[PDB]
């Protein structure tokens, strides 16, 4: 929990060019065979997004400003992305939100969590009979006044490591609309070497959290591996892009799926 | 209103009508029935765990159960006829089901007969000011049953203790188990009772032979709260059959209106309950139970 | 009218309705003392659970503040310029040209 890793270091936030990622459904309304205009917190196309990744000496999990709502996109082989923390201080001084994906249940909690110096989730015993399951839990040290708690249904997520190029794409949209959060998400396979996958997509709802807390910062939760200082990460990459209240022209097909978007 | 000819006279405000075709009125079909189709209303919280428990906590340390994110059915609490006397303020147990609030607490305790009248909003007394106060915006009910044959004992049942004195008054549904000695005079009490020094914590002397005013009544208050969060505790609602191809009234989970519903080729995504046309006008629906 | 209408401890000559089954109509006079039904239980014309007595009386005391003292109210209703007038102030008529 409070024990820091051995190798991690904070490098400058190098940026890269995101072409067409950052579009989603503005609401839960069906519309087909129409070009609908909508103003909402969207990421502009050809905008700059930050270049983070996780390896055996960077291990990006800093606390960065939030201030509007941020777009997330992760390209993975070892499936390192687990969860995310929000809060005004990300500490027990106030109520902080948490989401986690321990490969069994998507748990959400809002208590007065104690800030860990370097939280992460653990994976152990690779030498023989790996089985790729989460073992240890170092996200928070304490909790109080846990008013809300949501838990998804049981499942089994593929944590098996993979070789070659990136193969899994997970993308989220997190924002703050007068305290209400609209967690949207998507998961799709890919084949990608560097920068960003060349493609198009649109993200759908996963959870709705009417919490009522003002947010200013957020933190990444990454998993680590080892055959709390001697832990090493796998192969994965994720980016950070701040949203803006811009207007897009969402091209809806006959089935209601977004096929194109134009940045005004 | 005699014939269509006079209606033409009244549309023009003239005692004669000339040759031609004139527009006189506008036909419209009216609704006939009312349909209700909400999601499932299962997962009731067993409130009987708090009312029909074998033993309750003391009054100063009254037990609290949290009720949130479930359907609350109060009709069983009234129609079962398993209890002696009830009392409400503003809304009846059957009518409470129509309200959706954030949280509900079953504030359970046991007091004497003459003290059940003190359980009311904005009320003062030995139970209201010192043990358990109801808010001014109280819109629930209080439920009681005579437990003289169970919560009594020969010679006084001192299992249920209570607060009698306090230097100030409590807030609504406030829980305070402190044993600070009540001091009426200026001399320090020095941790013991005496002249102008009486402990606030005392015991109930229930007995089968006591008068009705001092019999044990198992009282529990259904405290309600309206916090910043949306509502989470709603009552049960019975759905009806779905009507197709008829001008009637409609009421789904979050969509109300009048019209006619017919089968089509639209396919909503797993998260979408209704649809809109190109002009941002609602033109489609989804049954919350069927597909 | 605190100096005239007040009694030692209250005056039942002035009464008021606390509960009503429906919304009163303007300029309606309903003196029915029937029991108000607040719940789903039939009251059967008697008090009980969610069956309260609608009529209540004023409390006149020498210590009541201006918010509770009785004020003698009168309300004048009419129609303005719809028929030949019958209640006209001291407006002397003049000659016709």
Inter-chain CB proximity C39 and B92 less than 8 Å:
yes
Q: What are the distances in angstroms from CA A151 to CA A28, B145, B242, B259, C27?
A: 21, 38, 32, 38, 59
- Residue B34 near chain C (CB below 8 Å): no
A4 within domain boundaries: no
A5 within domain boundaries: no
- Residue B88 near chain C (CB below 8 Å): yes
Helix, strand, coil share (%) of chain C residues, nearest 5: 5, 10, 85
Inter-chain CB proximity B86 and C40 less than 8 Å:
no
Inter-chain CB proximity A204 and B228 less than 8 Å:
no
Query: Which positions 32-51 of A are in contact with B (Cβ < 8 Å)?
Result: 32, 34, 36
In chain C, which residues have their Cβ closer than 8 Å to the Cβ of B86?
49
Counting as contact any 3 or more CB pairs under 8 A, the partners of C are B
Residues sharing a CB contact under 8 Å with residue B149, sequence separation 6 or more, in sequence order? B208
Chains C and A, touching by 3 or more CB pairs within 8 angstroms: no
A180 is in which domain, residue-wise? 15-264
**How was this entry determined?**
cryo-EM
Contact between residue B200 and residue B163 where contact means Cβ atoms under 8 Å apart: yes
Q: What's the total number of domains in chain A?
A: 1
Q: Which of A30, A210, A255 sits opposite B229 (nearest CB)?
A: A210
Strand partners, B198: B182
A8 within domain boundaries: no
A232 within domain boundaries: yes
- Residue A205 near chain B (CB below 8 Å): yes
In chain B, which residues have their Cβ closer than 8 Å to the Cβ of A211?
229
Q: Which of A28, A210, A257 sits opposite B230 (nearest CB)?
A: A210
Strand partners, B63: B108
A9 within domain boundaries: no
A68 within domain boundaries: yes
DSSP strand E in chain A: where? 15-18, 29-30, 34-42, 47-54, 63-65, 69-76, 81-87, 96-101, 106-111, 148-151, 166-175, 180-192, 204-210, 217-222, 236-242, 244-252, 258-263
A2 within domain boundaries: no
Inter-chain CB proximity B269 and A204 less than 8 Å:
yes
Give the residue from chain C lying closest to B89, CA to CA: C50
**Minimal Cα–Cα distance from C37 to chain B, Å?**
10
Best residue in A26, A27, A29, A147 for a mutation probing chain B (most B CBs within 10 Å): A29
- Residue A147 near chain B (CB below 8 Å): yes
- Residue A31 near chain B (CB below 8 Å): yes
Domain holding A111: CATH number? 2.60.120.960
Maximum distance among all Cα pairs of chain B, rounded to whole angstroms: 110
CA angle, residues A84, A89, A91, in degrees to nearest 5: 75
Half-sphere exposure of B229 (CA within 13 A, CB side): 17
Q: Which of A30, A205, A257 sits opposite B275 (nearest CB)?
A: A30
Which pairs from A123-127 meet CB under 8 Å and 24+ separation? A123/A159, A123/A223, A123/A224, A123/A225, A123/A226, A124/A226, A125/A227, A126/A225, A126/A226, A126/A227, A127/A227
**Minimal Cα–Cα distance from B129 to chain A, Å?**
27
Half-sphere exposure of B109 (CA within 13 A, CB side): 28
Inter-chain CB proximity B267 and A256 less than 8 Å:
yes
Beta-strand relationship, B274-276 and A29-30: parallel
DSSP track, chain B: ---HHHHHHHHHT-S---SS--------PPP--B--B------B--THHHHS-S----STT-EEEEE-SSB---HHHHHT--SSEEEESSS-TTGGGG--BSEEEEEEEEE-GGGGGG-SBT--STTTTTT-BB-TT--SEEEE-B-TTTS--TT-BTTSEEE---SSPPPBT------PPEE-SSS--TTS-BTTEE-SEEE--B-TTS-GGGS-EEEEEEEEE--SS---BB------PPP-SS-EEEEBSS-EEEE-----S----TT--EEE-TTS-EEE---SS--
User: End-to-end distance of chain B based on CA atoms, in angstroms?
Assistant: 48
Q: Which of B267, B277, B278 sits opposite A255 (nearest CB)?
A: B267
- Residue C48 near chain B (CB below 8 Å): no
A25 within domain boundaries: yes
Chains A and B, touching by 3 or more CB pairs within 8 angstroms: yes
């Amino acid at each position: 929990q409070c024990v820091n890793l051995t190798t991690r270091t904070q490098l400058p936030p190098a940026y890269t060019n995101s072409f067409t990622r950052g579009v989603y459904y503005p609401d839960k309304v069906f519309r087909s065979s129409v070009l609908h205009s909508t103003q909402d917190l969207f990421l502009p196309f050809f905008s700059n997004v930050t270049w983070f990744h996780a390896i055996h000496k960077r291990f990006d999990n800093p606390v960065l400003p939030f201030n509007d709502g941020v777009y997330f996109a992760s390209t993975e082989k070892s499936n390192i992305i687990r969860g995310w923390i929000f809060g005004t201080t990300l500490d027990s001084k106030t109520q902080s939100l948490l989401i986690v994906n321990n490969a069994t249940n998507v748990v959400i909690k809002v208590c007065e969590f104690q800030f860990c110096n370097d939280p992460f989730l653990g994976v152990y015993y690779h030498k023989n009979n790996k089985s790729w399951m989460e073992s240890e839990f170092r996200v928070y040290s304490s909790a109080n006044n846990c008013t809300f708690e949501y838990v998804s249904q049981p499942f089994l997520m593929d944590l098996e490591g993979k070789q070659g190029n990136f193969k899994n794409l997970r993308e989220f949209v997190f924002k703050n609309i007068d305290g209400y959060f609209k967690i949207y998400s998507k998961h799709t396979p890919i084949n990608l070497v560097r920068d960003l996958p060349q493609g198009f997509s649109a993200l759908e709802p996963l959870v709705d959290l009417p919490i009522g807390i003002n947010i200013t910062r957020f933190q990444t939760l990454l998993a680590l591996h080892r055959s709390s200082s001697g832990w090493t990460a796998g192969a994965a990459a994720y980016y950070v892009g701040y949203l803006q209240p811009r207007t897009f022209l969402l091209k809806y097909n006959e089935n209601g799926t977004i096929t194109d978007a134009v940045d005004c | 209103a005699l014939d269509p000819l006079s209606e033409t006279k009244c549309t023009l405000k003239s005692f004669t009508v000339e040759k031609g075709i004139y527009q006189t009125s506008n036909f419209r079909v009216q609704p006939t029935e009312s349909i209700v189709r909400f999601p499932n209303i299962t997962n009731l919280c067993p409130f009987g765990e708090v009312f029909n428990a074998t033993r309750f906590a003391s009054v100063y340390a009254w037990n609290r159960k949290r009720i949130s994110n479930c359907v609350a059915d109060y009709s069983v609490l009234y129609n079962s006829a398993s209890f002696s006397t009830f009392k409400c303020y503003g809304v009846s147990p059957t009518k409470l089901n129509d309200l959706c609030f954030t949280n509900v607490y079953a504030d359970s305790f046991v007091i004497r007969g003459d003290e059940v009248r003190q359980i009311a909003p904005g009320q003062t007394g030995k139970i209201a000011d010192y043990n358990y106060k109801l808010p001014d915006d109280f819109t629930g009910c209080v439920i009681a049953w005579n437990s003289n044959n169970l919560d009594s004992k020969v010679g006084g049942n001192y299992n249920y203790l209570y607060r009698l004195f306090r230097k100030s008054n409590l807030k609504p549904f406030e829980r305070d188990i402190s044993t600070e000695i009540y001091q009426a005079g200026s001399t320090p009490c020095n941790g013991v009772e005496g002249f102008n020094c009486y402990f606030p914590l005392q015991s109930y002397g229930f007995q089968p032979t006591n008068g009705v005013g001092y019999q044990p009544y198992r009282v529990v208050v259904l405290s309600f709260e309206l916090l910043h969060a949306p509502a989470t505790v709603c009552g049960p609602k019975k759905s009806t059959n779905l009507v197709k191809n008829k001008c009637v009234n409609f009421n789904f989970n979050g969509l109300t209106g009048t019209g006619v519903l017919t089968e089509s080729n639209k396919k909503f995504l797993p998260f979408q309950q209704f649809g809109r046309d190109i002009a941002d006008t609602t033109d489609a629906v989804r049954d919350p139970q069927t597909l």
